[PDB]
Paper text:
The underlying molecular mechanism was intensively elucidated by analyzing the crystal structure of FLR as well as the co-crystal structures of FLR and its substrates. Of note, FLR and its widespread homologs represent an unreported class of ene-reductases with highly distinct amino acid sequence and catalytic property compared with those of all known ene-reductases.
To further illuminate the underlying mechanism, we solved the complex structures of FLR with various substrates, including apigenin, chrysin, and luteolin that contain similar A/C rings but differ in the B ring. The structures were refined to 2.55, 2.65, and 2.25 Å resolution, respectively, which adopt a very similar conformation with r.m.s.d. value of 0.18~0.21 Å. The structures clearly demonstrate that the coordination of substrate mainly involves the A/C rings, while the B ring protrudes out of the pocket. Specifically, the A/C rings of substrates stack against the isoalloxazine ring of FMN on one side and the side chain of residue Ile275 of subdomain-2 on the other side.
Residue numbers in the entry: 1 to 47, 68 to 308
Amino acid sequence: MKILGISGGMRNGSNDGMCIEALMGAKEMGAEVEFIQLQNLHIEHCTDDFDWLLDKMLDADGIVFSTPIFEKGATGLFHTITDRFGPRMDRGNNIIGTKIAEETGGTAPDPRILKDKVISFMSVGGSDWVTRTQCDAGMLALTPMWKVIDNEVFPWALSILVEDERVARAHQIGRNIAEAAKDIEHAQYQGDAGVCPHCHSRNFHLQDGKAICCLCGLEGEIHNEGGKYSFTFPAEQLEHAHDTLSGKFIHGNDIKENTGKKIANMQTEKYKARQAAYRAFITATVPE
Ligand SMILES: Cc1cc2nc3c(=O)[nH]c(=O)nc-3n(C[C@H](O)[C@H](O)[C@H](O)COP(=O)(O)O)c2cc1C
Ligand SMILES: O=c1cc(-c2ccccc2)oc2cc(O)cc(O)c12
């Protein structure tokens, strides 16, 4: 089993160390290990080394991703890798495209793209402003529905590489990812139960009569039993969650529908006159 470790920190920083630590836990379990340090990569924003990177990820059996915490979440670069995962890694779309190619004499997309895969995350911060990073990390897995084994947060971690019990946890995380990689079918989540009984998220967006899991999308209700919170939802919802084939198919179906309505609207005069007025009213300023 090949475990790929990826770090988004400074070269030779803590995130590198925690990720190599995990890689060592994986080798202890017999895995072959590799390491990518994202500062060596050129990756543009979602409007160039990205493909190479995705290639490396597709060939791994499990991945361990260690990211710094910036403004409570992952770095902008992690969000950019999440952005660029859409067009390439959505499991619903790649299932559709493989079916359609097979049945229309088209060429078979990358088999690899549809292989099951396990992934674990570590978020390393310098304080306790860390309340959005785990959800950030979950999003990356959600597009391709990789199985999250561990999704750990490390606050007050500027000097983490001399905190032995925490470097130990990182080692344990690499043990787990390698073990999960040995049997991806029967591998099971090893992290914190959280509140969402499905996502395991603790991030909810709250409006009157509707609490929504910020990760899996389930709409239900949050309950406070003497300061302990908990999340219920109608079973029917499970059809719609964003990390299920059912939920993705619907989601895409809605995209194709609304993208049709748009293309048509773009030919109306309402659309064309309004756009023409915008072009006339102002011009975008740019640097010299
Ligand atoms: C621009 C910026 C924003 C940051 N925001 C947070 C934050 O919101 N919460 C937190 O714990 N740490 C934050 N940090 C601290 C970084 O996570 C820390 O420098 C990083 O984990 C170091 O890892 P490395 O050694 O691999 O670079 C921030 C750091 C920078 C540079
Ligand atoms: O080492 C840090 C530097 C900065 C930081 C970022 C931009 C400008 C000046 C300092 O912010 C932090 C925020 C945190 O919650 C935890 C940290 O360890 C840091």
